[PDB]
Amino acid sequence: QNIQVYVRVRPLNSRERCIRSAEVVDVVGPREVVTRHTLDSKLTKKFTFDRSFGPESKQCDVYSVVVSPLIEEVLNGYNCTVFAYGQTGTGKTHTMVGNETWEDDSDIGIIPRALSHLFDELRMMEVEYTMRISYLELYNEELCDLLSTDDTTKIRIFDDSTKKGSVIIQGLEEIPVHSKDDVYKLLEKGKERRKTATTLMNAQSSRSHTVFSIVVHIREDMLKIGKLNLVDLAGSENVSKAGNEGIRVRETVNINQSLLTLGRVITALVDRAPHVPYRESKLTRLLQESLGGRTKTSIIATISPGHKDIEETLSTLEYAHRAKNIQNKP
Amino acid sequence: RECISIHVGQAGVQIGNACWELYCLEHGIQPDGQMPSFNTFFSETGAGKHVPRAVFVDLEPTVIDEVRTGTYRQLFHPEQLITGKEDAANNYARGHYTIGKEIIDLVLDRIRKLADQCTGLQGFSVFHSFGGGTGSGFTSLLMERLSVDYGKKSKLEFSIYPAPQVSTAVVEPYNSILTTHTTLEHSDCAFMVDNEAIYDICRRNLDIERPTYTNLNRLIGQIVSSITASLRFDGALNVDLTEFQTNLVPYPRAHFPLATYAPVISAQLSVAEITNACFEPANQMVKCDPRHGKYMACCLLYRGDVVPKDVNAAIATIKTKRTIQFVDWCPTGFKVGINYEPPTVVPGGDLAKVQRAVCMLSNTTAIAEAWARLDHKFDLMYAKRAFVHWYVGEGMEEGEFSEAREDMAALEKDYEEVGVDS
Amino acid sequence: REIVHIQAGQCGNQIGAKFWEVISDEHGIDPTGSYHGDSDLQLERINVYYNEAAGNKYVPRAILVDLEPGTMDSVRSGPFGQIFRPDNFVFGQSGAGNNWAKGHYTEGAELVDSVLDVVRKESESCDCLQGFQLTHSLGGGTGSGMGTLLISKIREEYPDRIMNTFSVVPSPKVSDTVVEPYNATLSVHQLVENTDETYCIDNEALYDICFRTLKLTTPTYGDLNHLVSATMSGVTTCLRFPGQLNADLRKLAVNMVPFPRLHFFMPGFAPLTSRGALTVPELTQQMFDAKNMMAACDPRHGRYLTVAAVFRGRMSMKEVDEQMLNVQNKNSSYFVEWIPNNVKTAVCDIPPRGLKMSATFIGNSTAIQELFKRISEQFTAMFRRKAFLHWYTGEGMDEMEFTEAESNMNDLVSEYQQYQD
Ligand SMILES: Nc1nc2c(ncn2[C@@H]2O[C@H](COP(=O)(O)OP(=O)(O)OP(=O)(O)O)[C@@H](O)[C@H]2O)c(=O)[nH]1
Ligand SMILES: Nc1ncnc2c1ncn2[C@@H]1O[C@H](COP(=O)(O)OP(=O)(O)NP(=O)(O)O)[C@@H](O)[C@H]1O
Ligand SMILES: Nc1nc2c(ncn2[C@@H]2O[C@H](COP(=O)(O)OP(=O)(O)O)[C@@H](O)[C@H]2O)c(=O)[nH]1
Ligand SMILES: [Mg+2]
């Protein structure tokens, strides 16, 4: 019932070596106790999580540890969701999606590995299935369907009478998939349709919340609908650090104002407020059922080990640790 | 032997109004610039005109008009007058990143024109508000550019700090946390005064139930006048600005002096009886208690007709009345400022024509108590995470707050640490 | 700094008529556009609400929009009838008639784009936009219909600008038709997510103030506008004249809003009395008193989040803050705990003409949760029978559009429950 919360540490990037930033954060894999501190190793804080991940770990390894055990539980008729969030350039987009695209061995991301891995899972049961996908990005409080051909229709988000936590979306073209080749041709267009710009922090820095959900029906009779939300959020952007002068600065407002709403959702749920303000962000309503409902959710945090970006590193770890107190309704 | 002026934000403009008015009247300058019938804060062109070495920059064009469209518009050259086009909305975030980055470059250009016009720059005085946004964001970025170009220069700050109880804006406690990292690391000397205790004097010594900003500002102006303008005239012992960083700041991160100045009588004042009031807690201009803390360093500056020889007895009476718990690190830390020139009353002011005046500067552990007043105010609003979206909107992340909050704790301990040593 | 103000709907167009009449009498500008005042400070910030014209004339930077010509023609007929330039009139025939679906979605939508052109043309000739004011109804189909869509397109074009709304809340006391509450659920459904700040006014309070303090026997409908008229001027007062703490519009928004959703406030004008004592503390007592709240709720039922005070006249904040500090202590239960200073002071130097002192109240308290509970109950009760839906169903509005209007409404109401106590 408790939400699994893991954390990954990225290696030092070029600028981290160009500014000559030393490693202040270290990990212990099996013990899952990430040790972080300031420059002078005098006082250090202790963070306990379900798992830890060093910089040399692979993409399929993190997929094997946390994501893989949740693949098999989808068929029972339960929802799952996992997303990375944190400072810009921590490596969230590469962790969830992967930079360049069969087996669960190479540096391929989580999403195309999930399609390859789950496809055999359904074929092993020999069940009747109708699997579809969904690619959308939240850019400046607007909904744009990547998978859809036209997407000119004004996409709104409505509530539902039966499903209390869920929300109804109009205009989501649920294309059926029976072969992995068909999924890869559209998904690569999705990341081709993914709005991205070049920043000094990251030349391939995400510029929108890409909530990539997966839904499949099961019929063999007790009908079941499998639901999995492979969410890829935008990172927190220190507007001075990234560097922009403009149209990009309008993007920073909506992205940064959105993450701030996310944290309060955890703040209210941990302290058990009578109600939680999901209504202030479209993003919050997308994960409203995911956060404090009938869903086994997980979170994969990424943090830079740079001594300079210690503040965003330490502050981001707060919501990660507090999330273990949040409960669900299995 | 010359220094320039910086007045940022509405606080800086209206305060300087009396400051330069004093400066203009202290030396017999007319409101036009034509001295009828020394040059430290003014340059003189051949036309018989003086110009103030000032920098008045505001992000809102509202307040500047009062000076350049009313009186004193002849004394200023619009060359110095820089003006923005939209207020920072009391947001350090918008003041620092959004708007200030687009104006700051214009300001720096006017500075190098003045610094070259002067010879042997002594430094400059900073005027802004810690509570207000304009005085928080635009100031902070401005200060950082100064230390980059002018490393070996004095940086005085007069930041009016809000009251523990009385307040004007709601987000005042948020700006103070952001400015702490800015002033402490960059600025060498900063002065914090609060209008609350300033009200206390105006309704006790002046017996005035209608004190406005103008009345409080004329008081602050007299403090700055004796600190610099008097030190441009020779006496028994003249003082400079630079020794304060060594005579008043005995360690790098120990610089937030307390200022007192209370020769305030409505229209008999002996010498020593006046000096006693400088240590009376009831007119310290900041809501704190000297008995709660201790006294680290303290230097005086005497104005007008003062004779040092019989003065030494009065200084001894401070030691003879030893109930203030003077610290052990500095036994003989008393630099005496002796200026022969007396202060002057502005016509229509609320101060009486005195023949002698004394203004005290002193660092102490009592200023650490004022931080205890603030710290709780900041933490409560941060717990519910309210009003935080505005600062995130301009792009300053919340991580700045967590980082800056520790600097408040670390600084407040450093003052507490000194008392322990014996 | 420039600000554009919009009028929409049968009621909204009437309210502004007195508004500009006050602002014109403020600076002393004759209706025709010639300036004949005596104060030079009046021309110091004329740019805020006017554009310079040929022959030294002035044009109210206004946009007059409606679905019915008769109401607007009366404005151009009476006094200040030539003050607008007729090109700003944008209207059509076949008024909606309390039909929000027709005003917002189907009919006004054809006229919407024509207004945006006049809105877009106005902004570019202006130096730099500051805020956007829209006076309209919440229960009236037309103003709420077009106005909500008007705000959606405008804010989409101008994310950096201020969306201030002076709107009239459907009063549970007096109305002509019992179908009025339906519009409110449909009105705010678009407002909160697309508005920066909102002002709430009730007719019951309107007649309440004119009856109690003014002691008038026949409260005319125009005289009620005379009350709301100056209240908007209080918000703008920091922009026109030089003051001690000139709190700009966006500055005021940041001081009140504790969270990007809860931005509904209750204005009120204190210094109004019968012919019969005029001190500065005299204003402070009337400020906190419930008899000046323009909402149909007791502010003491809930608790305050933030309170802005804008004073008009030669005043010392010492006389203010000491008087102000008592309110923090006198009613300690009335303010929340995590905000130490609930007050926001703003001292504009110049008061209005005639009076020597004045006070402008701006407060966001939890009391508004009650005002919306009035609408929600009637909305849900009439929704169960599905009565008079075919009046709206045929226009092309799905049922689920109403469904979210229910939950999203009460969520705003439930927010203040926690923040109160
Ligand atoms: N004692 C005193 N305080 C002043 C005076 N003028 C301004 N202040 C303080 O300055 C604070 C606001 O500072 P500013 O940043 O300069 O205000 P601003 O220039 O309009 O810029 P914003 O704060 O962003 O609106 C107020 O809360 C006052 O307490 C003054 O004349 N006397
Ligand atoms: N574990 C890792 N080892 C090496 N390089 C990595 C690792 N994780 C991420 N990177 C690289 O770091 C850069 C940042 O990629 P990205 O995933 O976009 O960062 P981010 O934190 O997601 N910021 P954003 O793009 O806005 O989501 C890319 O060039 C990745 O290839
Ligand atoms: N203050 C004020 N309110 C008015 C006036 N005229 C109408 N109203 C209010 O406006 C509300 C309905 O507005 P409405 O006439 O339907 O606007 P419409 O949408 O254009 O039709 C009513 O409940 C009235 O209380 C007026 O002159 N002054
Ligand atoms: Mg200000």
Numbering used by the authors:
A (entry chain C): 18 to 118, 125 to 243, 250 to 274, 276 to 360
B (entry chain A): 2 to 38, 49 to 278, 285 to 439
C (entry chain B): 2 to 44, 47 to 279, 285 to 360, 369 to 437
Extract from the study:
Among them, kinesin-5 motors represent a unique and highly conserved subfamily that is essential for mitotic spindle assembly during metaphase and spindle elongation during anaphase. In contrast to the majority of kinesin classes, kinesin-5 motors adopt a conserved bipolar homotetrameric organization, composed of two dimeric subunits folded in an antiparallel arrangement mediated by the assembly of a 60 nm long central minifilament. Each kinesin-5 motor consists of a conserved organization including: an N-terminal motor domain, α-helical neck and bipolar assembly regions, and a C-terminal tail domain. Using biochemical methods, we show that the kinesin-5 tail domain decreases MT-stimulated ATP hydrolysis by binding and stabilizing the motor domain in its ADP or nucleotide-free states.
We collected cryo-EM images of KLP61F motor decorated onto MTs in the AMPPNP state, and the KLP61F motor and tail decorated onto MTs in the nucleotide free state. Class averages for the MT-decorated segments in the two states clearly revealed repeating motordensities decorating the MT lattice sites. New and previously described image analysis strategies were used to calculate and refine structures of MTs decorated with the KLP61F motor in the AMPPNP state and the KLP61F motor and tail complex in the nucleotide-free state to ~4.4 Å. Model building for both the kinesin-5 AMPPNP and nucleotide-free motor domain structures revealed conformational changes in α0-helix hairpin that may regulate the affinity of the tail within the motor domain. Compared to kinesin-1, the kinesin-5 motor structure revealed the conserved kinesin fold with two longer and reorganized class-specific L6 and L8 loops which form part of the motor MT-binding interface, similar to the map of the recently-determined S. pombe and U. maydis kinesin-5 motor domain structures. Structurally, the kinesin-5 motor domain can be divided to three subdomains, comparable to those seen in kinesin-1: the N-terminal subdomain, the upper subdomain, and the MT-binding subdomain. The MT-bound subdomain consists of the α4-helix L11 and L12, as described for kinesin-1. Comparison of the KLP61F motor AMPPNP structure with the motor-tail nucleotide-free structure revealed conformational changes within the motor domain leading a major rotation in the α0 helix hairpin, and suggests how elements of the nucleotide-free state form an effective binding site for the tail. Compared to the AMPPNP state, the N-terminal subdomain in the nucleotide-free state rotates upward by 20° causing the α0-helix hairpin, which lies at its extreme tip, to move upward by 10 Å from the MT surface.
